Design a protein around this ligand. Structure first.
Ligand SMILES: Nc1ncnc2c1ncn2[C@@H]1O[C@H](COP(=O)(O)OP(=O)(O)OP(=O)(O)O)[C@@H](O)[C@H]1O
Ligand SMILES: [Ca+2]
Ligand SMILES: [Ca+2]
Ligand SMILES: [Cl-]
Ligand SMILES: [Mg+2]
Length: 998
């Protein structure tokens, strides 16, 4: 458990799961049976996660039908009749090199001995008969430690997932949240001793919980101790004898210790008779047990007749209903059978829906990780995902639509029908972003057949970014030899490997207004659907605005660690993304960042800002100044003449104080350290001593503020040497100074610093000339030949969180922690500071696969033009686990009294002529739509307000003069507000047309 986890590959996953959990995965061997789409999806997610060893088992040989459900199989494999597991093994191995993947072709029978399974910690079973599953479940739960058991299957549009980790299973962390921290006001010297908490915040503890202690002064003995506590009252608890310990003074933090929690699982047989579920939708509470009855009936039918129901066959469907009614009588609550679920299960049972399998596989993969690590709360036995909304809106369809045509889409055709398959083939989709969700979506397109008709199919994928190692953890199309290559291009070539017929147009562009020429209104109207795999709200709002303008549907999705969400936006049926409450995340006060920090977050922000200011902004301004004003002699002449040059002062100082060699950079780092962590504290203490109190009679340096303490530089201390080394390197690269690791040695730095250290004890600040000083500096520089063109140029650094060599993160961490030490806030690790400073989002493959599969199901509904009832928005948290499906937000229709009602999608149109005035436009809007404009705006430009200066003049002005198109386009779009209400009300966009010629 001392292995070094590769942060370069698993950086985001480490934020989701934690190093300890990953270390447990590094020891885990998992056995997976059945290599259909579901099994391959699960194996893919587990291998990417880093499970030490995955055994891949299948008895069946490749067929054409498999080519539709398997994204690594080939026609060559089908012709040679290779084993499904053996054919795909190298491709799966390529996903994670650290993992060891092995294939088994051993037949699995009742006669077969199950002893071999003892090597594995977890067993996942797909495409296996229920009787043998029960036998393996008994074997696995009877072992000690018990082998954890998962059973997963997808039949048509219905799915079944089961988890049994043993009669007793230990959940080490339930939510994944950091443990709560309590602050100690006092601790008594008594038997038992009593710990007391700050009166502002109660501890909210339990009389049995265990707490660890740190940062106590006086009672130094308690630090590092774990004590089981007894709650005396809110704000007070009893730990144990403290009389022998030294008397308490101040401080102290108590952190709760997570105690392993026991969860109990019943066997597969017991659960089949009496199943357990977490019911999410109380609109349909009985749905899961009805699906359970139908799926169990399907298993009984498979046993009796050794085959699944045929599409259309009434004898088979009637027999399945009989078996379901019998099962319902055996079930404890005598649940009434659902005929629709049984009918559709018989109808689609021979089909396989790949998007649903992607979703189920993501959920099942997370369950495997839960079994081997204990990191999250496990599925409490059953999950029954369904795609019933896809088949319900079709109506009563022709059984011939769902009959095979001898092509790879037979599986999909058995679930959704040939007509919708063809609609998917004849599709124009715009995929904005090609990240984790983008890669999963491209796989789901290739298996669904999207854009495969040559004549009228196209998938447009656009991304500006290049591939990185950290991406490889969750972007399975990309591989290590693709690093530093465009994402869109690489994904397109891989997607073509999955499906040769697919048509993909790949771009390296960013979807912003600058590229609106490439992605114009014509382009959007051509596109049947737009799907956003973005990471920022600004891009989502821009694409949402574009979709609203061109009345096209948008599918939006996102992943945060184990959390995920899907949003479906359909024109004229649902509300759009821009309709949200759009709250800004945070707005730290300048005072709290630059003078009075209270949190490690504040200091990390200050360190990031200092990195950008020192090594990006100032170099950029320096280069721009000298290129704009050419020679230094010309700049001096301009300054003496009296011309105004922006930023002359700072640039001249930088040129005067420019480092020329490594020792100068080391000196600069030392002086900057002194200014940041010594002088700032003393100057703040001078303007504001601890004694001053007058905000409210007698108040200052209260609980929010922290008084600073000066820091004394010691090269022996670790943070000090780290700051010096990384700061000097960064300054040196900015000023193009050559240096070597020999220079970075602490001994060499000590010879530079201690021998030649000028540290004057500066007095407090508070305790024409500047222009002349700059003139003197510039004069001396040009005189000494120091202002050569080479010295008037600097190098600009770009913050890169993912390069350990560059030293950006190490400088930020040292600066943040040194500032924290000054204000006494507790430090943060390098990786925690990296996450905060780089705004890294925790990400894992299971969640992205789950979210993407769900979005693909919604895309199927959108291509069929389904009703509002069918579309569903989703929120998933795989930690709980919970999946919440809600009806999509209904389009809001706003009507002003005696006005035409309007929605986000509607745009009102008014026509213009050569002789037209603002008053004419106002009257025209009132005539056509029944409501009178009381405000007119173009862009940010204000055209009309009734309560404004000179409103009457503007009312009669001609429209062409009032607008300033420049484009001299056929129309200009104006925003309109109406008075009725004591505030103005927004109205639909009004489009004015300059040319009519009628
Ligand atoms: N306006 C835009 N147009 C096109 N692609 C965009 C736009 N904005 C962001 N993207 C892309 O959206 C994708 C989002 O996916 P993802 O979360 O994996 O990003 P990432 O950079 O790989 O994240 P991380 O930094 O955690 O590795 C990225 O490929 C990013 O390049
Ligand atoms: Ca339904
Ligand atoms: Ca990137
Ligand atoms: Cl500075
Ligand atoms: Mg991103």
């Amino acid at each position: 458990a001392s292995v070094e986890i590769d942060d370069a590959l698993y950086s985001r996953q480490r934020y989701v799961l934690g190093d300890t959990a990953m270390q447990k995965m590094a020891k885990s061997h998992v056995f997976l049976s059945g290599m259909g789409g579901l099994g391959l999806e699960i194996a893919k997610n587990l291998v990417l996660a880093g499970i030490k060893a995955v055994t891949i088992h299948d008895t069946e040989k490749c067929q054409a039908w498999d080519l539709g459900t398997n994204f690594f199989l080939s026609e060559d494999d089908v012709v040679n009749k290779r084993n499904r597991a053996e054919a795909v093994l190298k491709h799966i191995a390529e996903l994670n090199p650290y993992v060891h993947v092995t294939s088994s072709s051993v037949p699995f029978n009742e006669t077969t001995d199950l002893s071999f399974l003892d090597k594995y910690q977890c067993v996942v079973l797909t495409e296996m008969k229920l009787p043998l599953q029960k036998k393996i479940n008994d074997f696995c739960r009877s072992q000690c430690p018990p082998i954890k058991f998962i059973s997963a299957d997808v039949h048509g549009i219905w799915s079944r997932l089961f988890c049994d980790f043993g009669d007793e299973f230990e959940v080490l962390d339930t939510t994944g949240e950091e443990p709560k921290e309590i602050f100690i006001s006092n601790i008594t010297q008594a038997n038992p001793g009593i710990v007391t908490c700050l009166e502002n915040h109660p501890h909210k503890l339990e009389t049995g919980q265990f707490l660890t202690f740190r940062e106590i002064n006086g009672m130094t003995g308690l630090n590092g101790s774990i004590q089981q506590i007894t709650v005396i009252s809110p704000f007070s608890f009893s730990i144990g004898d403290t009389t022998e310990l030294e008397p308490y003074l101040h401080g102290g933090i108590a952190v709760q210790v997570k105690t392993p929690k026991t969860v109990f699982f019943e066997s597969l047989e017991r659960q089949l008779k009496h199943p357990k579920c977490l019911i999410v939708d109380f609109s349909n509470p009985e749905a899961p047990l009805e699906i359970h009855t139908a799926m169990l009936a399907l298993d009984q039918f498979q046993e009796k007749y050794s085959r699944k129901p045929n599409v259309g066959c009434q004898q088979d469907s009637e027999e399945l209903l009989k078996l379901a009614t019998s099962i319902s009588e055996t079930l404890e609550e005598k649940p009434d059978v659902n005929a629709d679920i049984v009918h559709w299960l018989s109808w689609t049972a021979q089909g396989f829906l790949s998007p649903l399998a992607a979703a189920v596989g993501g959920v099942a993969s997370q369950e495997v990780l839960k079994a081997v690590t204990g990191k999250f709360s496990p599925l409490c036995q059953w999950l029954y995902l369904e795609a019933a909304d896809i088949v319900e809106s079709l109506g009563k369809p022709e059984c011939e639509e769902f009959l095979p045509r001898g092509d790879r889409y037979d599986a999909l055709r058995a679930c959704i029908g040939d007509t919708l398959c063809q609609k998917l083939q004849n599709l124009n989709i715009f995929l904005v972003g090609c990240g984790a969700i983008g890669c999963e979506m491209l796989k789901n397109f290739a298996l669904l057949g999207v854009g495969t008709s040559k004549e009228k199919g196209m998938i447009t994928v656009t991304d500006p970014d290049l591939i990185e190692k950290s991406n490889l953890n969750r972007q399975f199309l990309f591989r290590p030899h693709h690093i530093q290559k465009p994402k869109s291009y690489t994904a397109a070539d891989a997607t073509l490997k999955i499906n040769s017929q697919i048509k993909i147009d790949a771009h390296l562009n960013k979807v912003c207004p600058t590229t609106e020429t490439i992605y114009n209104d014509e382009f959007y109207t051509k596109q049947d659907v737009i799907i956003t795999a973005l990471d920022n709200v600004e891009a989502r709002r821009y694409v949402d605005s574009r979709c609203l303008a061109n009345l096209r549907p948008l599918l939006d999705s996102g992943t945060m660690g184990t959390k995920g969400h899907t949003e479906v936006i359909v024109p004229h049926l649902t509300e759009s993304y821009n309709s949200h409450r759009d709250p800004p995340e945070e707005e730290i006060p300048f005072a709290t960042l630059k003078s009075f920090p209270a949190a490690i977050e504040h200091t990390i922000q200050w360190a990031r800002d200092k990195f950008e200011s020192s090594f990006s902004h100032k170099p950029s301004l320096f280069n721009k100044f000298w290129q704009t004003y050419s020679s230094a002699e010309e700049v001096l002449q301009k300054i003496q003449s009296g011309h105004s040059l922006e930023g002359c002062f700072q640039v001249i100082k930088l040129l005067s104080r420019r480092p020329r060699n490594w020792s100068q950079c080391v000196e600069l780092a030392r002086l900057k350290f002194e200014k940041y962590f010594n002088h700032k504290a003393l100057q703040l203490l001078h303007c504001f001593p601890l004694d001053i109190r007058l905000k409210d009679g007698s108040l200052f340096w209260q609980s929010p503020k922290r008084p600073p303490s000066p820091i004394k530089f010691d090269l022996n201390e670790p943070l000090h040497l780290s700051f010096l080394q990384n700061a000097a390197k960064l300054y040196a690269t900015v000023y193009c100074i050559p240096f070597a690791e020999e220079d970075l040695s602490a001994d060499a730095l000590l010879n530079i610093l201690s021998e030649v250290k000028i540290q004057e004890f500066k007095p407090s600040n508070k305790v024409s000339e500047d222009e002349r000083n700059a003139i003197f500096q510039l004069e001396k520089a040009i005189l000494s030949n120091e202002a050569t063109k080479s010295d008037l140029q600097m190098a600009v650094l770009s913050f890169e969180k993912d390069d350990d060599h560059n030293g950006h993160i190490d400088f930020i961490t040292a600066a943040s922690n040194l500032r924290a030490k000054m204000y006494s806030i507790e430090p943060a690790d390098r990786f925690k500071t990296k996450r905060i400073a780089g705004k890294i989002i925790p990400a894992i493959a299971t969640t992205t696969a789950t979210v993407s599969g769900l979005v693909a199901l919604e895309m199927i509904k959108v291509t069929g033009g389904y009703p509002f009832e069918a579309y569903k928005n989703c929120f998933l948290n795989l930690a709980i686990p919970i999946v919440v499906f809600t009806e999509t937000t209904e389009v809001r229709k706003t009507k002003i009294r005696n006005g035409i009602s309007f929605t986000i999608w509607d745009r009102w149109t008014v026509h213009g002529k050569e002789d037209f005035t603002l008053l004419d436009f106002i009257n025209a809007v009132k005539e056509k739509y029944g409501i009178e404009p009381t405000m007119v705006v173009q862009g940010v430009k204000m055209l009309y307000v009734p309560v404004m200066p000179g409103h009457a003049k503007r009312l009669k002005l001609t429209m062409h003069k009032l607008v300033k198109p420049t484009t001299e386009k056929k129309y200009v779009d104006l925003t309109v507000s109406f008075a009725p209400d004591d505030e103005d009300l927004p109205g639909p966009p009004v489009r004015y047309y300059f040319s009519h010629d009628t």
